[PDB]
Structure formats: structure tokens, C-alpha cells
Amino acid sequence: SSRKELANAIRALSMDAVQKAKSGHPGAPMGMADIAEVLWRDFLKHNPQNPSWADRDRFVLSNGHGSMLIYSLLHLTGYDLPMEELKNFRQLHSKTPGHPEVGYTAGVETTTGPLGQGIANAVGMAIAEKTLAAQFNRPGHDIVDHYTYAFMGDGCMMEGISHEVCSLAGTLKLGKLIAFYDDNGISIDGHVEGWFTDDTAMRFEAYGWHVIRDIDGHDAASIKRAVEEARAVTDKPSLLMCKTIIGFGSPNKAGTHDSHGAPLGDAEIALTREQLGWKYAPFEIPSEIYAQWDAKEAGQAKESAWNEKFAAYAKAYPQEAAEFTRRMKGEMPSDFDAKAKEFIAKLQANPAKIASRKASQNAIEAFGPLLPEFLGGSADLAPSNLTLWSGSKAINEDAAGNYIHYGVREFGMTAIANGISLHGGFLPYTSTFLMFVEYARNAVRMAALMKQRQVMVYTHDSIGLGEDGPTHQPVEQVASLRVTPNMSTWRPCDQVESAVAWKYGVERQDGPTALILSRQNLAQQERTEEQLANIARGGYVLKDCAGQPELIFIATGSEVELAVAAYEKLTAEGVKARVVSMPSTDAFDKQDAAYRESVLPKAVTARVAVEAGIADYWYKYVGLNGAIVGMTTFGESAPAELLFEEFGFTVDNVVAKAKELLHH
Amino acid sequence: SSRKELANAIRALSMDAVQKAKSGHPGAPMGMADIAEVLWRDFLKHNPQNPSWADRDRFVLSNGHGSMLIYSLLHLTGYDLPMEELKNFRQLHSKTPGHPEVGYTAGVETTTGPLGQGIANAVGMAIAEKTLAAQFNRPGHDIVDHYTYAFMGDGCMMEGISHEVCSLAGTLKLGKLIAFYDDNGISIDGHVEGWFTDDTAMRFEAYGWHVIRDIDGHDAASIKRAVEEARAVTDKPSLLMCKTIIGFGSPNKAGTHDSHGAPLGDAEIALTREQLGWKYAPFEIPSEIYAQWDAKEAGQAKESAWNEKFAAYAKAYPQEAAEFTRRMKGEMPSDFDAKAKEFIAKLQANPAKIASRKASQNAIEAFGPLLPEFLGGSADLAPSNLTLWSGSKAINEDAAGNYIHYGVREFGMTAIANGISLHGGFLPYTSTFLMFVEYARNAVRMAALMKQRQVMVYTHDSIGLGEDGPTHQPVEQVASLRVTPNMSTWRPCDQVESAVAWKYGVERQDGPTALILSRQNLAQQERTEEQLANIARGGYVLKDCAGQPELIFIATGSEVELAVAAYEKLTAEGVKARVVSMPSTDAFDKQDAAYRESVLPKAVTARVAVEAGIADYWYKYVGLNGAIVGMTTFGESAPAELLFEEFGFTVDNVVAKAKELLHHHHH
Ligand SMILES: COc1ncc(C[n+]2csc(CCOP(=O)(O)OP(=O)(O)O)c2C)c(N)n1
Ligand SMILES: COc1ncc(C[n+]2csc(CCOP(=O)(O)OP(=O)(O)O)c2C)c(N)n1
Ligand SMILES: O=C(CO)[C@@H](O)[C@H](O)COP(=O)(O)O
Ligand SMILES: O=C(CO)[C@@H](O)[C@H](O)COP(=O)(O)O
Ligand SMILES: [Ca+2]
Ligand SMILES: [Ca+2]
Ligand code: NA
Ligand code: NA
């Protein structure tokens, strides 16, 4: 068959699957099919029989609404994605959700949809390949060597995150990153000139990319030559400016916004079949077309050749090969748990009053030698977030390093780190001031949705940061993290809880962990062995009474010391008081009911929550018959001590609120 | 005095104020002082005695950590910002907070700090000036004519939001926007080449800006020439790339990251005075330097001339002049309240089962003729968010229009709209799918912090959107808005609540209002006159029983219909039940204790919340002895009706959960 006919198989499957679902996006798949045919058939290195092959090329669809493009490609090339799944596009529990999801579908590398994040993930995958190659390749043994290809459209280009990640990709000279821009002139509001007029090629040259202008995206020869040129440029990422017609093939809807996001309609599909010369019924693909698209034979040959290369590497570099396998599987060192517990015990035995930002740095220092998979960084806040340890080596200085200077790019950093975690081989950590989680907020959500391990180091957690004032002082950010599905959030009260939280984060296998860390020094609490072991349960009894409590304080982070002081004053008066430290609500909620009852007995309604964050969260644990010593407003610019007084974080106020609650 | 001596007054006040506070940022004020001296003394059109003059130039410090720069300028030029306030930099309830805050300080135009948002606000101020000029100027009467000047640094340039807003500024040919880039080579991690290597000039060329390269930012004559050039270019925004030395004047810290964000130290300040030739003690400024910096006489003259221009305009164009004054003051038309109430009453009397996105469009259509100040838009989702009405006119087509095609730029859109609201003359509305509030999330917070009026139209609010799936289906986003100080969030259950929420939003002068709107059609509920009036109280009794209820359902948005159906089933079985519609938790919480008790009586603990959003929020209203029919997970890609079934939003499940709750209460 001709290359145009092979590409038209994508067009047919895509328009027909959208039509059957009565939902979805035919335009971009139809517009990009010729580009996809060249990339996938002539260049992409992959094995449909093993989508997890460590050295495969990675493909990312940043314009993820065009999901039928990737489903068509996966089906045609021989992945485990049968025609009946394409006939179930957008249907409950199918392998073909409306935007592609990692884990749902063989061969999907990332979850896209939210514009701009796919290209960010691709930048992270390319950073991962470059760094892993530098760490593991040896003379005569280049076990890491693969490309990262991304498709993206006008939406991704308009989004700010594209500026963040493509600027950084230029600095890092990511020569194996090749992006294809679907330059079709159309967005949802219509012809893009009314709102998008950049000289995109000039912009990307300003980032230090190699840019190929004016590619005819409907001409295989033009596309193929451009990809060859891009592959030959090894010191710069490449952008291929592909001029396409959205909805290519449709007489009446090609080149129109109408083709973006609704079924074409039966009559228009019939006219499109006529225009394309496509004679096959919906969901019919002839054996000649499968034979030319199928990648099983070539893919298995390429993966087998790589396996033989890896076996030879392992004979010359046995310890390195074992590390490669461990890290690509995402497994932890066998002795990590024991060594981390030893560190935690040493902290409990040797008290220190330090900020939890510093306790975090100390945990990175302790873990660093044990976790060569770390690939950490901060968004231009290394000396403030405290993300460097003695063994940090920045990848802009040493490609085999373990640290990224992300610049002032919080959203891009977080979505890059999602690509790093998706790639395999690394454990990313990212960092900024907690307030600026709001810049990165949807990438944090995406880490949780995609079940990715990433430690998110968020310092300067409250009014305790002081004079920088209300634009910087978090109030409501922790509450929002706490209610995000699959997110783990820890607000440690001292250096011991900080180390436990770090351990919890690195040991997660199926989602991210946010650490909520202080600028100001935090006192260390005394703990029994049982209490020390129970920090990891997220909530535990720190101070107690004999018998059933009359009053329970629930406190987190920097406010535990305040709650303890109130407990001491009320205990001396003869109140049966308790203090619960709640560093992680999510870990606590996952405990068994007997444990939760032992900490927060259901019969004890006189509960006082104490936290320098938004009060409304705490109704979850205090109900309607308790009290909350929290924030209800933005902060103010002043020294931290005076802010804690101004906002009621005083022993007198905590005691008064407890007494008012006990007097009923 | 020489220009350098006058600039050195800024350097002295800035380093000394930081030193006294033992906190703050001396580097950027010291690096930009010469640029500021030229801009403020030779070009800026302003009156220190009236910071609210409608036609003043607007200045924005996007690198807001350099707050002592703006406090020095305001003090030296004669604003009501006494030296004692500079001595109280970063102290509780001073007029000199660590990052500048609009409202705290005479002459501060916006609250900055969070990088990139100041340049976005400036783009919005420049859009506002261009649009207002096109709407109001008449032949011989150019009553709107002012510049927007912004300072920004490497951090703002790295941030994605700068790409969004500067790309759009290029499309809109904002010739009165002039930005100065503090190109000093330093960020917090050190020398920026390790992480920031853009050819920034070429980037801005790609946006359609007029770029002036390689300006010596310590040479007044060079700066002045560059500003003159930028003013002469009327068809492009301008970027002045000013090469500066961070901490200029400090022998040991100039050009270093150490100068960014800590006091220089007393010993270093002494050496800096010696290098600069600045002899005056901390907080000392001689009368001769005030005489050269003061802007009161020139500012009076400029505003007086403008007032005479406006008087001539008002004689020739009396109705237009009255509209200009009304809109610049942020006042509403005198008949708006009555006309909006008439619309709301007509909707209650004439049911329609439509999506609340459509009810929103219908409210825009109804209000549009009454509110010529609207300056609305969507982030490339006009046909989905339903933000156009018959009178919309995009400003890229006609500069006197009322609508902005923002493109796929949610964060930039929202921070531009903050600039629009700060400028005066307009009532902005912005729009995207609710999920993508997460892209714009800190700009929403900034609108709340700055007490700005903006209506945020967030459609596709739940799993009810269907097949687009979990990356698009909000779950926890509304709860995040609900816990934001000074935010107002409305999740209307029908077209009537939607119109009430729109009215509330446009009439809310001291903060923003988010509308949480459905893709799918919503049933209209029956209401008495009192219930209709009670929608605006945020939470109200929609269905009731005689005597104390056994059970109270609390529901919002699309789930009110489900809660009412469950109420009807249980009522028919003899259960004493009540339904509370809670379109706005923030408005409900602001009602007095007696009203809140009347809706959610403390004696009734068997409370069932029903909302297709994160369950954990609802403990606030149901306590520990109730039930929540909510989401606890991400969504799924499927038809909406199957998702509602899958996730338990069915009459059978709500009734079962309510009966299970009652069984537990009884035993
Ligand atoms: C912030 O994140 C975000 N915001 C909005 C949308 C909705 N949306 C999908 S596509 C597109 C605009 C056009 O995107 P574009 O790639 O040009 O596509 P085609 O129409 O296929 O050419 C828009 C506006 C999204 N998915 N993600
Ligand atoms: C997302 O929002 C955000 N993130 C981080 C910061 C902290 N910060 C202030 S400044 C700067 C980096 C350097 O900013 P830059 O203008 O080059 O300054 P100078 O050091 O004065 O040259 C950084 C990193 C902020 N305020 N806002
Ligand atoms: O610019 C910033 C914050 O935006 C920093 O310079 C801080 O203002 C001070 O840093 P720390 O002393 O809190 O680490
Ligand atoms: O691209 C998008 C959403 O990201 C749109 O095309 C929607 O997928 C369909 O729009 P509505 O029918 O919900 O308005
Ligand atoms: Ca497009
Ligand atoms: Ca700088
Ligand atoms: Na290349
Ligand atoms: Na100009």
C-alpha cells in the first residue's frame, strides 16, 4: 500500500471510533496521520510485545485530545489493544479513554489532556535518558540510547509551561528530544491569528533549539527528510514546524474549528471516505495494511539485540548492571529500610531544634549515598529550600549528576519530574516555597493521578516565615493537598518526624508525597519506642493522661510545641488532656479502625485542632462540637513571633479555646 | 545634584531600611535605581497628591521583592508615605510590607511578589487603557492617554506566565506598554547561565515586541534615549534590556547572589556609602534632594490640565462623561439592581431545564446591555464556556470592543484580568473549564488578596461532563476555592440560582466570585418569594417538614435534584426530612448565627451532604455523625449518566445512605 493509504487507516479508525462514541476529537488525528506514519514506521524504536523495554524510544502525545491517533497507532503496530477496544472508545472501563492514560493501555507513556504537560513530560523523559546514559554507559557498552518524540499543537505552544520546559531543554542541550508542532492554524475559538501570532520558530531558536520550518505535514518525503535532519543534530533539541490541515480528508470540515472536538457526522464521513479513496467499512482493516504497520517482528529483533548488549554489559560491569535493573524496576535497595530506621532512631536519641527545611536537607544527606537514583532539584531556591547535599552534582555541570537547577519554573519543574518518574531509573524530588505549589498545582495532581513517585519538598509553610508577608505565607494550600486523591502530605513537627516523612515518600510505590516544611526552628519532642514507631502511622498519641481523655489537642508541624504547652497547663490544673501529633492525615486515615480509635476515641468530642493553616479543614477531625485554632484570613508582613501572637497561636488563646470548649 | 546622586537616594533608603528591618532585598533596588530615577523624574505622568487620578501612567514592579525601590520612589516624589513608614519596613501594620500591596500604600498599583504576575497585571492595565481610549476618546477629546511601565527581572522572564502575557501583548499591539528587564545575570541559585540561557531579545522579537538591547542600566543618558525610542514606537510593546549590577555600590556584594535577599550588613553599608559618595545618615535626605525629586508641582499641573480637558469633554459629551466617571469609580448603574431582580423573578416564574453554563450565558446576555463596563473573555473556550453574547465584540477586531480571546493562557488570562480590575473602568470576567483553575490558581488567590471584583466563569464542573475523563473532571477544585480567604464560590443548582450568583458577583466590590457551572442540564426547583430571596444568603431551606427534621440533606449544584428526589421518597415513607440548597458556603458562613441555626439547627445531627466533589470538605457542615455522598477518587472516561451511577449519585443510593445513617442514630 502507499504511505498515504497507510496513514489513511489512522484517519478511518479515528473518525469512525469518534462517530461510534458520539464523542471525541477527529481533527488532530486526521491532521497528524501522515506525520505519525513516517515517525512510527520509519524511525520509532519500540517493541509492541514489551511496552516496558528499558531502552525503547518514548513517544508523547501532548495534544492528548487527539487520543484516537495513539490508539490507532498502538492497534495497527501490534500492541495488545484489539479492535473491540477501539469500538469502545470513551466507554466505561475501556482501554481507550477519551484522553490517553498511562497504565490503562499498552504503550501509552503518560497521561495527557491538560495542555502543555505532555511536552513537559517529554522534556523530563529526555533528561532522564541523557542522565541515565551518562551514569551507566561505558566504553564499548552504550546500554542507554533512545529518543524522545513529542507531538504538540497550538494549545501546548500558547501555554506558559511550554516556555518553561523548552527554555530549560535548550540549556540542557537535549539532542534526542524531537518535537513535532501541528501547525494547523485552528483552535477552539477559530482561526488562531486573533489570539496567537508568535513567530514560533524564532521563539524556539531563542531557546537554543534546532528548528525546521515549513514542513509539508501531508507529504511523507518532506516529513522524512526533516526527521533525518533532526536526528543528525545531536547538541540541540529539534522542533519540526509541520503545516497540517486539521480534519484532513473531510471536504466540508477540514481546516475548520468544527473538526476539532465533535463527531464529523455520518454523511461527512462518507464524503471523507470518498475524498481519501478509503474503501473499507468502519473497523475494517485489510491484511496488507496490517502487514505494513505491524512492528512485532522488528520490535522483538531490536529488543533481543538490546538484551544481548545488556548481557555483555553485565559481564563487564556486574554491579552497574544490577543497579540498572533495580533502578529501572523502581525497587528500593534491600538495606534501605534498616539504614533509614537507624538514622531515625539516632535523631530521636540526639535531639536538635532546627527548622524542618534543615531536617529535610539532613535526610537528603543521609539518604543520598543509599539512593543513587535521586534526581533532585529546586526552582531557583537551593539555598532556601535546602535541596543540596554533599553529593549533589548539577547535571548542567556533569551529565552523570543527580541535581537539576530548574530555574524559576515551578510548573515546568513538576511536570518534568513527572516525566522523570515515568521514564524509570530515577526517584525525582522537586522543591519550591509551599505557596508556589499553586503555580504547579495541576502537575502535582497529575503525579497523583498517574500514581507516580515524586517527593515534593515545600518549605516556608506558614506565617512562621515572617516578613515576606501574605503573598508568600501559605494558609489554605495544605488543606487542598490533603483532599487530593492519592496524594500523601506530611507536616512534620521536628527533625524526627521529618526523616520519617522523607522515608515514607521515597518508599511510596504508587504516588507522590508532599513535605510541608518550616523556615523557623522546631523543637524536638520526646518519644517512647512505640511513639517513634507510630510516626509512620500519620497520627499518634504524643502526650497522654491516665484513662479516657476529657480533652484532645490535635496538632501538626510547628504547632505541636504550642499544643504541648497548652496540654501542660491544663494537665497541671487536673484536666485529663491528650496531645495527638498528626503529621499525615492520609497515613492516619489508612490505619485500622482500632488504631484510629486509640488515638481519637469516638466518645471524646472535646477536640481542639491547632495548625497555622486554614481552619475549615479540621472539621474532618473535630466535628461540630470541637474547636479549631487556625487561620481564617491571609497573613501579614511582620516578624514571625509577632504574627503568631497576632493570629492567636499563643498558649493563652489555645488554653482559652480549650476551656471554653470544656465549659460547653 | 547629579542624576547619580539622586538615584543614590534610592540606594541609601533601600539598604538602610532593609538593614533596620534585618530582613529584605537590597540587591534589585540598588541595581535598578538609575533606571527608576530616569523613568520617574523624566517621563512618568503622575500626581502624588491624587494617586487615583484616572489618566495617570501606571507603574508596576513585577520583581516585587525589590519593594524598597517603590517605597523610596513614592516617598521621594511626595506621596503620603512618611519616612517613619520606611523605618517600619516589614513591621506589623506598616504601610511598607515586605512585598508591595495595593491598598496599603499610596501609589502602589498592584500587589506583587509572586514572580511573573506583575508583568501580567501590567499587560492588563495596558489592555484597559487601550480599550478605554477606544471606547471614550472623541475627535478633539483624547481623555484617555497614558502609559504602562513595568520593571521585571530574570525570575519573571523564566516564569511561563511571562510567555502567555507577552505573547498576547504582541498580538494586541500594546504600544503604550514599556517594560524594563533588569538583566543582571544573577538569581538565587547564583549565575543564571546554569539554568537560563535564552536569547531573550530574540524571544521578545518573536512575540512582536520592539526590543532595545544592551542598555547600560547605570547610565542615565542611555536609559533616557531608550525610553524616548520606546515611546516613539506606537504599534508594539517595548522591552528595554537593561544591563545592571545587582547591589550596585557595594564593593563586596555587588554582582553577587548574596545581595539578593539579605541585609548587606552594617560594615558593608559603610563601605557602600563610601563607594557611592553618599554622606547622609540612615533615613536622612536633605531639602535640596527632596526639591529635585518632588513631583507635587508638576503632578498638580498635569492633573489640572487633564481636569480641564475632561470638563471640555463633559460639555461636548455629557452622557459619555457621566459613564466614564461611573465606570472609573466602579459604581453600578442605578437601575441595575431592579432590572437584575426582574430577570431573576422571570426565570423563577418560567422554568427551563438547561445547563448552568447556558444559564450563565443567558445572564451575560441579560446583563450585557446594562454593563458596558464588562471586559470578558475565555481561554480558547468561548463555544464551550458560553462566554459570548449577542453584543460581544472582540478587541482584536475592534479596539472599542468588550471581549478578549485570551488563547490557551489560563494563568495569564486571570492575572491580566487582575490588571484590568485594578486599572478601573471595567468589570472583567474570565473563563475556562473548572479543572484548569489549577493552571491559574495563584492569580485567583491574588484577586482575593487584592480585594478585586472579577467574575470567574468555570464550566464543566464535575463527572457530569462525561467522556473527557479524569484529567478534566473536577473533584477537589471547588473545595480548594471554598477555603480560600475572601473568595466567593457559587455552585448554582438551576438557572435561577445561576442568575442570582451572577448578580452577586457583579455587585461584589471587594473580592472575586467564581461560578461553578455544569455541562449537563439542571432541573429548576420551585421557590416561594422568600426562598427566591434567600438564594443570595448562600444556604437556604428548599424543602422542609413540620417539626424538627430527623434528617437534613445539604446539596449543591447538579446534586440538588438528586437530594430533592431522595427527600420526596423518604417523606412519602413518613420520614421528617429537610433539603438545604447550599450554592455558596462563603455567603452562608457570612450570615449571622441566628440565620445559620434556622437552616442547619444544632439539634439535628443526622445530616447528609450530596455533591459530586471531594467528600472530605463536607465534614464542616455534617460533622462526625452524618453521611456524605461525594467523590473520594478521580473520575473516569465514560458517558456522564453512567459515571453518576458508578459513583453512587442515584436516588437509591442516597436513600439507602440516609436510612443507614438513621439506623445508626437509632441504635
Ligand atoms: C489548561 O489546559 C487545558 N486548557 C484547555 C483545554 C481544552 N482544549 C483542548 S485543545 C484546545 C485548544 C486547541 O489545541 P490544539 O492543540 O490547537 O488542537 P487542535 O484543535 O487539534 O488543532 C483547548 C482549549 C485543555 N485540554 N487543556
Ligand atoms: C512562583 O513565584 C515565585 N517563586 C519563587 C520566588 C522566590 N524568588 C524571588 S526572586 C527569585 C529569583 C530571582 O529573581 P530576579 O528578579 O532575578 O531577582 P534579583 O535576584 O533581584 O536579580 C526567586 C526564586 C517568588 N518570589 N515567586
Ligand atoms: O526572594 C525570596 C522569597 O521570594 C527570598 O530571598 C526570601 O525573601 C528570603 O529567603 P530565606 O531567608 O527565607 O531563605
Ligand atoms: O477539547 C475540549 C476539552 O479539552 C473540548 O473539545 C471538549 O472535549 C468538548 O467540548 P464540550 O462539548 O464539552 O463543550
Ligand atoms: Ca491547532
Ligand atoms: Ca536577576
Ligand atoms: Na537530534
Ligand atoms: Na511605545
- 3-state SS record for B188-235: CCEEHHHCCCCCHHHHHHHCCCEEEEEEECCCHHHHHHHHHHHHHCCC
Same domain for B290 and B393: no
d(CA B635, CA B474): 8
Q: Among A502, A588, A489, A486, which residue's Cα sits nearest to residue A537?
A: A588
d(CA A313, CA B78): 74
Q: Among B26, B30, B17, which residue's Cα sits nearest to residue B84?
A: B17
Residue B308 buriedness (CB in 10 A; 0-12 / 13-18 / 19+):
exposed
Tell me the three cell numbers of residue B133. Answer: 481610549
- Starting from the CA of residue B24, give the closest ligand: 3
d(CA B182, CA B115): 13
Instruction: Kindly state the helix (H) or strand (E) to which residue B640 belongs, with its residue range.
Output: helix B640-646
Are the C-beta atoms of residues A537 and A595 closer than 8 Å to each other?
yes
Are the C-beta atoms of residues A637 and B98 closer than 8 Å to each other?
yes
Instruction: Kindly state the helix (H) or strand (E) to which residue A529 belongs, with its residue range.
Output: helix A529-534
> Chain B residues with CB inside 8 Å of A168's CB?
195
Number of helices (H) and strands (E), helices first, in chain B?
26, 20
> What number of other Cβ atoms are within 10 A of residue B586's Cβ?
20
Phi, psi of A241 (to 5 degrees): -80, 95
Tell me the three cell numbers of residue A562. Answer: 504550642
Annotated catalytic residue, options B164, B268, B373, B410: B410
d(CA A168, CA A147): 18
Residues with Cβ within 8 Å of residue B178, at least 6 apart in sequence: B147, B148, B149, B150, B227, B230, B231, B237, B238, B240
CA dihedral A384, A389, A393, A396 (to 10 degrees): -10
| Residues linked to residue B631 through DSSP beta bridges, in sequence order | B614
d(CA B78, CA B294): 5
Same domain for B114 and B164: yes
3-state secondary structure of B506: helix
Residues with Cβ within 8 Å of residue B250, at least 6 apart in sequence: B26, B30, B259, B264, B268, B271, B272, B275
Percent helix, strand, coil in chain A, to 5, is 45, 15, 40
d(CA B618, CA B640): 23
Q: How far is CA A287 from the centre of its chain?
A: 40
Instruction: Please name the residue of chain B whose CA is at the shortest distance from the CA of residue A161.
Output: B160
| Residues linked to residue A215 through DSSP beta bridges, in sequence order | A242
Instruction: Kindly state the helix (H) or strand (E) to which residue B664 belongs, with its residue range.
Output: helix B651-666
Q: Say which CATH number the domain at B139 has.
A: 3.40.50.970
Q: How many CA atoms lie within 13 A of A134 on its CB side?
A: 18
Q: Does A257 sit in the ligand 4 pocket, CB within 6 Å?
A: no
d(CA B489, CA B417): 18
The residue among A291, A325, A359 that closes a domain is A325
Q: How far is CA B355 from the centre of its chain?
A: 27
* Full DSSP string of A264-295: --HHHHHHHHHHHT--PPTT---HHHHHHH--
Give the β-pairing of B238-243 and B210-216: parallel
Tell me the three cell numbers of residue B157. Answer: 522572564
d(CA A389, CA A402): 11
- Starting from the CA of residue B115, give the closest ligand: 2
The experimental technique used to determine this model is X-ray
3-state secondary structure of B562: helix
> What number of other Cβ atoms are within 10 A of residue B145's Cβ?
14
* Full DSSP string of A378-438: ESS-IIIII---TT--BTTT-TT-SEEE--S-HHHHHHHHHHHHHHSS-EEEEEEEGGGGG
Same domain for B565 and B509: no
Domain count, chain A: 3
d(CA B273, CA B281): 9
Indicate left, alpha or beta for A396 from its phi (over 0: left) and psi (-120 to 50: alpha).
alpha
CA dihedral (A248, A253, A259, A265) positive or negative: negative
Atom of ligand 3 minimally distant from the CA of B261: 6
Are the C-beta atoms of residues A497 and A582 closer than 8 Å to each other?
no
Are the C-beta atoms of residues B39 and B58 closer than 8 Å to each other?
no
Strands of the sheet with B177-183, listed across from one edge:
B58-61, B148-152, B177-183, B238-243, B210-216
Sequence ranges of the binding site of B for thiamine diphosphate = 65, 113-115, 155, 184, 260, 436
d(CA A189, CA B386): 11
Phi, psi of A525 (to 5 degrees): -90, 145
Are the C-beta atoms of residues B27 and B260 closer than 8 Å to each other?
yes
Give the β-pairing of A238-243 and B427-433: unpaired
Choice from B22, B61, B65, B253 to test ligand 3 binding pocket (greatest atom count within 8 A of CB): B65
Q: Does A182 sit in the ligand 2 pocket, CB within 6 Å?
A: no
> What number of other Cβ atoms are within 10 A of residue A646's Cβ?
15
The residue among B509, B536, B563 that closes a domain is B536
Are the C-beta atoms of residues A525 and A542 closer than 8 Å to each other?
yes
CA dihedral B507, B511, B517, B523 (to 10 degrees): -50
Residues with Cβ within 8 Å of residue A537, at least 6 apart in sequence: A587, A588, A591, A595
Are the C-beta atoms of residues A387 and A421 closer than 8 Å to each other?
no
B/e letters for A54-83, b = 16+ CB within 10 Å, e = fewer, are bbbbbbbbbbbbbbbbbbbbbbbbbbebee
- Residues within 8 A of A (CB atoms), B 30-69 only: 64
3-state secondary structure of B270: helix
B/e letters for B514-533, b = 16+ CB within 10 Å, e = fewer, are bbbbbbbbbbbbebeeebbe
The residue among A497, A515, A536 that closes a domain is A536
Are the C-beta atoms of residues A514 and A488 closer than 8 Å to each other?
yes
Same domain for B468 and B513: yes
Same domain for B135 and B156: yes
Q: What is the largest CA-CA distance in chain A?
A: 90
> Chain A residues with CB inside 8 Å of B438's CB?
441-442, 445
- 3-state SS record for A530-550: HHHHHHHHCCEEEECCCCCCC
Q: Does A28 sit in the ligand 1 pocket, CB within 6 Å?
A: yes
d(CA A381, CA A361): 13
Residues with Cβ within 8 Å of residue A147, at least 6 apart in sequence: A43, A45, A57, A58, A176, A177, A178, A231
d(CA B663, CA B257): 66
With vertex at residue A102, the alpha carbon angle to CA A100 and CA A103, rounded to the nearest 5 degrees, is 125
> Chain A residues with CB inside 8 Å of B196's CB?
167, 171, 407
- 3-state SS record for B373-385: CEEEEECCCHHHH
Are the C-beta atoms of residues A609 and A629 closer than 8 Å to each other?
yes
Phi, psi of B26 (to 5 degrees): -85, -20
With vertex at residue B614, the alpha carbon angle to CA B611 and CA B605, rounded to the nearest 5 degrees, is 60
- In the reported structure, the alpha carbon of residue A173 is separated from the centroid of ligand 7 by a whole-number distance in angstroms of 9
Are the C-beta atoms of residues A200 and B202 closer than 8 Å to each other?
no
Give the β-pairing of B374-378 and B354-355: unpaired
In the chain, the amino acid numbered A517 is L
With vertex at residue B103, the alpha carbon angle to CA B374 and CA A410, rounded to the nearest 5 degrees, is 75
Domain that holds residue A555: 537-664
- Residues within 8 A of B (CB atoms), A 301-330 only: none
In the chain, the amino acid numbered A184 is N
- In the reported structure, the alpha carbon of residue A47 is separated from the centroid of ligand 5 by a whole-number distance in angstroms of 31
Give the β-pairing of A488-490 and A455-459: unpaired
| Residues linked to residue B456 through DSSP beta bridges, in sequence order | B430, B514
Q: Among B581, B662, B572, B600, which residue's Cα sits nearest to residue B625?
A: B662
Q: Among A4, A73, A38, which residue's Cα sits nearest to residue A248?
A: A4
Same domain for A289 and A236: yes
Q: Would you call B373 a catalytic residue per the annotation?
A: no
Give the β-pairing of B540-543 and B577-581: antiparallel
- Out of B21, B195, B486, name the one closest to residue A405 (CB): B195
d(CA A15, CA A249): 10
Same domain for B57 and B179: yes
Instruction: Kindly state the helix (H) or strand (E) to which residue B182 belongs, with its residue range.
Output: strand B177-183
d(CA A12, CA A9): 5
Q: Among B413, B415, B339, B340, which residue's Cα sits nearest to residue B378?
A: B413
Phi, psi of A476 (to 5 degrees): -105, 0
Interface test with B, best of A95, A104, A433, A439 (most B CBs within 10 A): A439
> What number of other Cβ atoms are within 10 A of residue A265's Cβ?
16
Phi, psi of A16 (to 5 degrees): -70, -40
Name the DSSP letter for residue A141.
B
* Header resolution in angstroms: 0.9
- In the reported structure, the alpha carbon of residue A209 is separated from the centroid of ligand 7 by a whole-number distance in angstroms of 10
d(CA B60, CA B149): 6
CA dihedral (B310, B311, B317, B320) positive or negative: positive
With vertex at residue B494, the alpha carbon angle to CA B490 and CA B495, rounded to the nearest 5 degrees, is 95
- Cell 464556556 belongs to B385
Tell me the three cell numbers of residue B365. Answer: 446576555
How many residues in chain A? 664
Same domain for B253 and B170: yes
Q: What is the largest CA-CA distance in chain B?
A: 90
Instruction: Kindly state the helix (H) or strand (E) to which residue B501 belongs, with its residue range.
Output: helix B495-507
Same domain for A310 and A383: no
- 3-state SS record for A5-71: HHHHHHHHHHHHHHHHHCCCCCHHHHHHHHHHHHHHHHHCCCCCCCCCCCCCCEEEECCHHHHHHHH
- Say what angle helices B3-21 and B27-38 make with each other, to 10 degrees: 150
Give the β-pairing of A210-216 and A148-152: unpaired
Are the C-beta atoms of residues A525 and A564 closer than 8 Å to each other?
yes
Instruction: Kindly state the helix (H) or strand (E) to which residue A151 belongs, with its residue range.
Output: strand A148-152
Are the C-beta atoms of residues A161 and B116 closer than 8 Å to each other?
no
In this complex, is the C-beta atom of B617 within 8 Å of any C-beta atom belonging to chain A? yes
- 3-state SS record for A476-516: CHHHHHHCCCCCEEECCCCHHHHHHHHHHHHHCCCCCEEEE
Percent helix, strand, coil in chain B, to 5, is 50, 15, 40
Strands of the sheet with A607-614, listed across from one edge:
A540-543, A577-581, A551-555, A607-614, A627-631
d(CA B9, CA B69): 10
Same domain for A432 and A387: yes
d(CA A370, CA A400): 17
d(CA B564, CA A380): 52
Sequence ranges of the binding site of B for Mg(2+) = 154, 184, 186
- Cell 470538605 belongs to B617
Tell me the three cell numbers of residue B222. Answer: 542611555
Q: How far is CA B621 from the centre of its chain?
A: 29
**Protein residue closest via CA to atom 21 of ligand 2:** B28
Rounded to a whole number, what is the distance in Å from the CA of A407 to chain B's nearest CA?
Answer: 6
d(CA B525, CA B95): 49
Q: How far is CA A393 from the centre of its chain?
A: 23
Rounded to a whole number, what is the distance in Å from the CA of B634 to chain A's nearest CA?
Answer: 7
Q: Say which CATH number the domain at B590 has.
A: 3.40.50.920
d(CA B392, CA B378): 12
Same domain for B287 and B333: no
Tell me the three cell numbers of residue A189. Answer: 475559538
Same domain for A340 and A320: no
d(CA B228, CA A277): 62
Rounded to a whole number, what is the distance in Å from the CA of B483 to chain A's nearest CA?
Answer: 6
Cβ of A380 and B195 within 8 Å?
yes
d(CA B347, CA B325): 33
d(CA B108, CA B130): 21
- Out of A21, A188, A441, name the one closest to residue B380 (CB): A188
- Cell 483532599 belongs to A483
Indicate left, alpha or beta for A124 from its phi (over 0: left) and psi (-120 to 50: alpha).
alpha
Are the C-beta atoms of residues B92 and A642 closer than 8 Å to each other?
yes
Interface test with B, best of A596, A624, A664 (most B CBs within 10 A): A624
